Amino acid sequence: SSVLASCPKKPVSSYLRFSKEQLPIFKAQNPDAKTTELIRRIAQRWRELPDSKKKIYQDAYRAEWQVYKEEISRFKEQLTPSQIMSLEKEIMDKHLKRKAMTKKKELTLLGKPKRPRSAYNVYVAERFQEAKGDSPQEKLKTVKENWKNLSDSEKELYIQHAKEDETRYHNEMKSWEEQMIEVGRKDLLRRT
DNA sequence: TAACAAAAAATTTCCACCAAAC
């Protein structure tokens, strides 16, 4: 399937090697505590630990790195050019997908207006509740069915609601893009 | 970032149809 799935993973360095070893010991002694607080406590105990003790985890990491080197080397040597390329592409895709979802999260955090609703959207938003069907997919099928067999006279209401929201969008966007300059985020602005 | 855990919280998905912005 995916080259990346069978690709050997990095050995854990000192703190994760400690965290992994400690988490059970802490979870047993505090079973009603959230994982998150146990991790905060485990890190605390890491920070407090002597350098001589820390080094033992490090020494183990370093030794496992040499096994990793060996495994990964052996892995990549056994791969065909086309497999190496899927691996490189799989990694590129991994990055894009991450870059893309964080920008999306950013925009939400900056409260960017929602797109204008189409006449069709306005129709789903009001006809879906009483639609025929069990699953939300089947229910959409009936609202799709009723929308396509609707006359231009009948659509006319949704046309005006979709028109009013197009003005809403225009207005919300004018304010938000203004506010985005005042904070120094003119990158966030539309070209067209 | 990618390495560990692990379950909460956030986001996509499934179906279609539609439109703004690139």
Place this chain on the structure above:
DNA sequence: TTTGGTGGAAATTTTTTGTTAG
């Protein structure tokens, strides 16, 4: 073209608590 919008239940991903180092 891509993206995100109408619906919500279920599936799936990201985040939450941390440090390390290639």
